[PDB]
Design brief:
The structure is a homodimer.
Chain A: E1 5-9, H1 13-24, H2 30-43, E2 64-69, E3 75-81, H3 87-97, E4 102-104, H4 105-114, H5 125-134, E5 139-144, E6 150-156, E7 177-180, E8 184-190, H6 192-198, H7 200-209, H8 214-231, E9 241-247, E10 252-256, E11 263-267, E12 270-274, E13 277-278
Helix pairs in contact in A: 1-2, 2-3, 7-8
Chain lengths: ~280, ~280
């Protein structure tokens, strides 16, 4: 088993991986490593994809989505939540502190406040400017720690200029994220609507359950999506979707509909940016 | 065995008589499942669906629903207020917008924009019981039509006195409902948190993709949930989850955790209430 190991989506996953390796290289839990890792990006306003500098919906509202899942089937999710910069951490409080698994809208913000989170203005002057002119989709991270346990986190501000209330795949278990500790974990990126439609990351893990490698599982799930966009008469060039995956032995893999997605991998060989296979 | 309609719980007999009015005439499975569950959304005496549904703990009735047709088109609304017919606003999300899921206030603004009428959904019986408290959980329906197309719908008012903002499995396409026209369809009922945790209905259909009969697929998915509640130190007696399923040949099946769940089946032999096997 290659352990510990962290994978995350896109370029900024290199930096996010350096914060998760601070937990993982000291033998900490994968759950804490993935929360620390993506919170780095939630905190950054120059990151316009995720949390604090996130582009608003069409009414000028920054509403965020995130979920988390640990090594023992516990899950928490928040979607369309406002004024709280770290939605991954309110999702961990839903998991840990409530008999529920998903809170949305105003009820997710009331619970965040009840848990001590601070209400902040998430709309930067740059984002408000571009919104009124208009008038890296997410970060997913999955890790295997030194006890050989898996956990994952996915967080986003959604599609810029989305309709007020729109929820994508990032807060939905089995679409932006799925973790089964006797099999493997996977997270998704892309047009969320398409990951929800195919229930993406649950399909990738179940293909690893049926004996596939992580890269093979990612590839066949992308090929199933390619088949369905053809069935729906859609043009593939308009749609993008990538998956990254990890199994229990620390083997990892990725694949996407189209070229140009990349992911960051940090194990005891160091941290690097790799470029997956692509269908189109 | 077509056309054929299945729906959850004893009120599924009556809901099935409205879907057979479309199915028996050659109409579309999509229209049959929407007409079928709207019957129950309309009835004030049905306290877990639509009008008359028990409110969250703040006395707000917020509803969840999704729909999926024979070609991976999907629509969903969650935590929506003041609209009696959430399955129909979910069909408008699918048909009229670039998104597949709207929640909270944004789902209600879009409903109004599409001509739906704002109504007060808390009955005098539900407000009484809510203030007393202050001191069958959904309907899922799946059908195969005379063209041999599958479609499904699931709608609920959620767990009574749930935290404000809680969303169950009913509006989530990996979870309360999944339809793949080359394989089969399934809908779920029970404690929504547990169906979300296990991506219930996507797992049932993928087990039918692997060759399981509808009843076998439902049974093995319930047994996976039983394994996971044991892995989490929880008591099975505290949980009920059931699945009903249908494949492309119109074979059907169901299974649950505890006894006492039945479902309604209407094909050309007639409409009847059947009782599946249970795990506990």
């Amino acid at each position: 088993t290659n352990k510990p190991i962290v994978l995350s989506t896109w370029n900024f996953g290199l930096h996010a991986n350096v914060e998760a390796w601070k937990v993982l290289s000291k033998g900490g839990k994968a759950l804490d490593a993935v929360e620390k890792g993506v919170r780095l990006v939630e905190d950054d306003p120059t990151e316009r994809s995720v949390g604090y500098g996130g582009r608003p919906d069409r009414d000028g509202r920054v509403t965020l989505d995130a979920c988390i899942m640990d090594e023992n089937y516990n899950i928490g999710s928040v979607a369309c939540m406002e004024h709280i910069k770290n939605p991954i951490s309110v999702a961990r409080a839903v998991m840990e502190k409530t008999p529920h698994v998903m809170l949305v809208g105003d009820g997710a913000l009331e619970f965040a406040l009840s848990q001590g989170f601070k209400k902040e203005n998430l709309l930067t002057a740059e984002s408000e400017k571009e919104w009124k002119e208009w008038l890296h989709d997410c970060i997913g991270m999955i890790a295997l720690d030194a006890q050989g346990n898996l956990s994952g986190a996915c967080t986003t501000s959604g599609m810029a200029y989305k309709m007020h209330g729109r929820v994508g795949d990032s807060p939905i278990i089995g679409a932006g994220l799925f973790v089964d500790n006797e099999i493997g974990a996977a997270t998704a990126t892309g047009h969320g609507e398409e990951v929800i439609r195919t229930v993406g990351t649950h399909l990738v893990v179940e293909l690893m359950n049926q004996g596939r490698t992580p890269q093979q599982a990612c590839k066949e799930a992308v090929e199933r999506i390619v088949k369905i966009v053809n069935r729906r008469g859609k043009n593939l060039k308009d749609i993008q979707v990538g998956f990254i995956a990890l199994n229990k032995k620390g083997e990892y893999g990725a694949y996407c509909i189209q070229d140009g997605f990349n992911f960051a991998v940090h194990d005891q060989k160091g941290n690097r940016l790799e470029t997956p296979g692509f269908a189109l």
